[PDB]
């Protein structure tokens, strides 16, 4: 343990000094990129019968001390509930009410005082939370989209404002990121926000082939995303959209 | 040959001018500070003076000569040399830039601070505590540099809000066909369109009249035809201004009337926002990048039209050009012509399936142009030829050459399904609005 | 020696060209168009339009100091060509000069 | 060096135009350059440049030739040839009567240089002791033998 | 390179052998104490016991682990791993060279210092004044070797 | 590498102070064609001008821009440019070295040239014919500068 | 040289002949090579490989050793050896009675080579001038000094 | 590199030389003799021949093809090839000096065998009388020379 420290800090010192001549250039992005990519670096670096029965005593006692609600007592029935670190996925056709769907389980997250980290890449954030007041308020979505709300919908509207506006939740309508990038976006979170104990996404596209290798698969980010679950230790949501077959 | 910080004096210059853009301009005050800081200065009778600049501001005070000299906070004085040079400096508009690389500079200046100190830290070793503490100078860096960051919604909200009760006081672009804006609701900011219709059909042409909709609300059009060139979709279009029939548009011989308002409606669409790309046969970077260069050349621009789209994979297209959707934020459009195997089924009615490694998702909106007159006539020679086995044009001709036609609004994200009736003129190609 | 008469000019229509864009961000385009940084003669020029061209595509102004900023940081352009540019007289439609 | 304490450039920025203004007033009075030999060599200038300038100028007083632009241009070494910028700026430079005290700053520097150099030898000398013990007392002789 | 400590640990080496041999030969002291100093000592707890060896001397007291033990200047303690490993040396006769050669180990220091001292000098753009620093000096470093 | 070209322009210049330093003082003409001919200049506007000034100086006419710009000899006519370029050097006093390095010059061309002209000789497998012909040229020089 | 005019060329293949016959006739005659040093040195050959045949010649007349094949190839300098195409290529040359008049023939073309160079350094000396007037007098002396 | 077996071929040229040159003046061997030895040769064959000329002419014999052909020692015969070859060889006046580059050949072949022994006592850890071993052999070749 004593060597591999000092080996640890003989690599530190290296890139302490890369990353200090990098300053004479002066792209502060770039240096930026070069922070990020370095920690991942020393992150990666830092991390039988009597083995397995260590974690079965950790899982009963865990039992002793289940998950996060769901918001449907019947999927509860089965899901028992979110498990930290456990990867789940939804395949569903579009219009079907996807979007809408996965707000609801937002807000059951939320009212269990748990932060919640959400992506969109295809949608914007604006309208995602739209959708969310619309089914707080109980306001057909049009009515909310156009402007004109009477008074008493504009009342029970700014009385749902606030309320979910102070609501751990967070959102990233960013175009086109990339799952390493998702990962490090969500290790900064989960650096910054310790109660954060959920995450959901909406959506990946599909491609099968080859081509879909190098331009942006989902076998091995659906891989690197049960990696990240069981490193930040909280179950990870995602959208899918199934094909037309 | 090389001299080390030459360039910070040029950097200190910067700084100078930021500060003379808000001097002049005391609004941009705001946008600096979200930004930049007192401490983030590299200069330091900048960095008090932008101090002073703030506490100013707070209180809702002009920002000038007079008011600087006389609330000088007196424990630190200004030497005579900067203060004049700071407004004797040549104003600068879009400092915005300037702003971002001044951060760009403290920035550095908090990373050589930073990896001088974690090495030194690391020395003394607990190694897995100086890794502990690499991890916590990464979260600080990460948190400090908001770049490309997360938050916040609430405040956006409000501002969506804002831009729709503007208009309550028509949500997105006008289609043209008030029977599809009532399921479509206009064409909606980043919303990837398609309209998947089979040659001949009037496909070419009836894009042209949706782009005028948009031309006549004065949105920026960017126009792609790969297969065709740009010369005949202006004379379709044309033809729909004019109300003039195709034939004899395109041979020459006009008469005094038609050439009259052929040339009416000439420069009011030289006026009108519209760029062409006859090149054959481009990219999806290609026009990604030619797309970042056009809106980067013209803000105006607020729609977008490709015709038409080849088949080789669909699904990666039809994503980088949702990605490009939400990317300029403006609803871009594209034209796909079916596979042959929609013809081989009975109902000869368009599905969204029939273009089929893997088949197309990405599509918010999908549309279908079906001819309702073109599938019974082919039924009508099968019925013969079984008749056989066991006039009516020129009717039509003098009825006003009007046929039924039906664009099927199959698929709508979040919204309505269904079918619309539209009445369509054969020889003009054109669709009647009613 | 009227190659390098020729020679003694085109370093001072590069130069021009070079200042006409500091002035005039936008003709970047037009100049890329045609010409490339090999294109060019004397090679601080060919490396200051190297440098222009990436300003542009990050859609960043064009000044004495971004170009000194964003040195590629492999070669820095020698003083007295760099300053030279900018004394240069700005001459408009210089695309017959391009 | 690594270290940047927003200072002692500015000194460096003095010498190179304290060197250019000595050499110009030069160009513009030939005979001072027997007191400025009298004082100052061309390895003592800083800048090279100078330095180079002003053994151009000696040898063309030593054969009664008088100092501008076009001798030295001529002139030229061809082992070594000064870029253009540092040539015409010396004639740029605003030449001031009565330069003595100037030429004493530039001697100064390249004291303060010979200096430098100097103690990082005798610094890593010691690493034998003696013989620093002597090397002492020869770089005393030979700082002794330059001031004097 | 692993190199400047090998020398090192070498002079702390000599400091400890010179020691022994005060230890045995109490007299040597004299002929010690006319050339070297508490300060011209590199390890601290050696020129500690020196100027302890020269309090003891100076009142007639013999040196050895007791006495050393116990006329502590309690100010600062000696490690007692230091403190045996100098009993434990090899004491060798006639050490008179290995004296000055602490003595030539003192010098490199005030030298490295002095040159140090001088570069400084060159930090701050004076140099006439700059000029007879070195003179100064070199009174100094003549004074101190002879 | 640019570098001949700079040395040209210069020896323009020189030709430029020269003649309008003589423009300036008209005595010095003889103490100059004394020394240098027409034909010597490198830039020809110049040698002509030198040839103007000679055939006005021998005829007792003064030299400025009135004399040249009539007393043209209507074969060949000098640049504007040139011309005026002339006039709006800075005249130097005493450039009596100026004249021999124009000299110094006029050498190197005449230098060139000849040294070309043995080139050709060795072009010409002849060589006591050739061996005479470098003798002949030694006069030529020898007499040339003295 | 770029420049090809159908002639010129013939001269060099008449002098490497030349310089083989005359090296001949010393093979056949051992006590010509005395009249031949007179005039003609190892450096004064063209062809490289008769130069150095030259110079082991004198090196054994001077030893009083007589001039064939084999003493030739013994006597190696080592430093560097003769392709054996120029070595046969000597003896099998034609030896021809009164050489004297072929031997100035090769002392000329060494005259013309030596002229060349000169010329070339020269002509680049002229780019400083009145050390070029100096330089011409220089090579008039080695000429001068090199016919008679 | 080819270059050691051209140097074989030539000195091999050599004796042939000299034998013809001893086939026809006979009176030469006298004084190649004098010099040469039967075990100085190279090349086998030509150090027989010369065996056989000695012993014909110690018995007034003269040397030519029909006497070596019959007076063969009848141990070794020379090859035809080789034979006839010696006399096929320009002979040339005067080889006295050519005996005597013969004779440096061979004292090459003794120096090698000379230099390669006192090797080989260097491969015997033995000095003194490795030492003696060289002072010994300098009396060999000393003699051999002179």
Request: some cysteine.
């Amino acid at each position: 343990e004593e060597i591999k420290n000092a080996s640890i800090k003989r690599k530190l010192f290296g890139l302490a000094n890369t990353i200090r001549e990098q300053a004479l250039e002066s792209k502060s992005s770039d240096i930026l990129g070069a922070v990020e990519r370095e920690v991942y670096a020393l992150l990666n670096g830092s991390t039988n019968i009597k083995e397995v029965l260590e974690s079965a005593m950790d899982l009963i006692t865990e039992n002793q001390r289940t998950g996060i609600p769901t918001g449907f007592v019947q999927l509860d029935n089965y899901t028992s509930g979110f498990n930290k670190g456990s990867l789940v996925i939804i395949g569903a056709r579009p219009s079907m009410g996807k979007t809408s769907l996965m707000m609801n389980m937002v807000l059951s997250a939320l009212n269990d005082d748990r932060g919640v980290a959400v992506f969109s890449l295809e949608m914007s954030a604006e309208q995602l939370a739209l959708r969310a007041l619309s089914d707080l308020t109980s306001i057909n979505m049009h009515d909310l989209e156009s402007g004109r709300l009477d008074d008493d919908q504009w009342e029970n509207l700014a009385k749902c404002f606030d309320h979910l506006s102070q609501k751990k939740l967070f959102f990233y309508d960013k175009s086109y990121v990339r799952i390493e990038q998702i990962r490090l976006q969500l290790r900064k979170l989960k650096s910054q926000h310790k109660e954060l104990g959920i995450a959901f996404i909406d959506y990946l596209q599909l491609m099968s082939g080859s081509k879909a290798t190098k331009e942006r698969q989902i076998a091995e980010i659906s891989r690197e995303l049960k990696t990240l679950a069981r490193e930040l230790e909280i179950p990870i949501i995602a959208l899918v959209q199934l094909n037309r077959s | 040959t090389m001299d080390h910080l030459k360039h910070l004096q040029q950097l200190q210059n910067i700084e100078r001018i930021v500060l003379s853009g808000i001097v002049l301009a005391n609004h941009k005050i705001e946008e600096v500070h979200s930004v930049l800081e007192p401490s983030d200065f590299y200069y330091p009778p900048n960095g008090l003076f932008f101090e002073i600049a703030l506490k100013l501001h707070e209180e809702d005070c002009p920002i000038d000569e007079n008011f600087i000299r006389q609330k000088m906070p007196k424990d630190k004085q200004i030497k005579e040399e900067d203060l004049v040079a700071i407004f004797a400096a040549s104003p600068i508009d879009n400092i915005e830039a300037y702003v971002e690389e001044i951060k760009n500079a403290s920035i550095k200046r908090k990373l050589f601070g930073l990896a001088n100190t974690i090495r030194e830290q690391a020395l003394e070793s607990k190694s897995s505590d100086i890794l502990g503490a690499v991890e916590r100078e990464v979260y600080a860096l990460l948190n400090g540099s908001t770049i490309e960051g997360f938050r916040n919604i609430k405040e956006v909200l409000e501002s969506a809000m804002d831009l729709i009760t503007e208009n309550q006081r028509v949500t997105g672009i006008p289609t043209g066909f008030v029977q599809l804006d009532n399921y479509t609701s206009g064409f909606n900011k980043g919303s990837l369109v398609i309209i998947g219709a089979r040659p001949s059909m009037g496909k070419t042409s009836l894009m042209m009249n949706m782009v005028l909709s948009a031309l006549n609300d004065d949105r920026g059009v960017a126009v792609f035809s790969l297969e065709m060139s740009a010369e005949q979709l202006a004379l379709r279009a044309l033809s729909d201004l004019t109300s003039i029939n195709m034939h004899d548009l395109e041979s020459g011989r006009l008469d005094d009337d038609q050439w009259e308002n052929l040339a009416k409606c000439f420069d009011h669409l030289s006026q009108k926002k519209l760029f062409f790309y006859d090149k054959s046969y481009v990219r999806i970077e290609q026009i990604r990048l030619q797309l970042r260069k056009l809106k980067s050349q013209h803000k105006e621009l607020g729609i977008a039209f490709i015709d038409y789209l080849q088949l080789m994979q669909i699904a990666e297209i039809s994503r980088e050009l949702k990605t490009l959707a939400r990317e300029l934020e403006i609803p871009i459009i594209a034209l796909v012509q079916l596979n042959r195997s929609l013809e081989n089924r009975d109902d000869k009615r368009p599905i969204l399936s029939d273009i089929k490694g893997g088949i197309e998702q990405d599509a918010d909106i999908v549309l279908f142009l079906y001819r309702g007159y073109i599938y019974q006539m082919r039924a009508e020679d099968n019925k013969i030829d079984k008749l056989k086995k066991e006039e009516e044009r020129r009717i039509h001709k003098q009825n006003g050459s009007i046929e039924e036609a039906e664009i099927i609004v199959a698929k709508n994200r979040n919204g309505a399904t269904g079918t619309v009736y539209t009445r369509f003129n054969a020889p003009f190609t054109r669709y009647e609005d009613m």
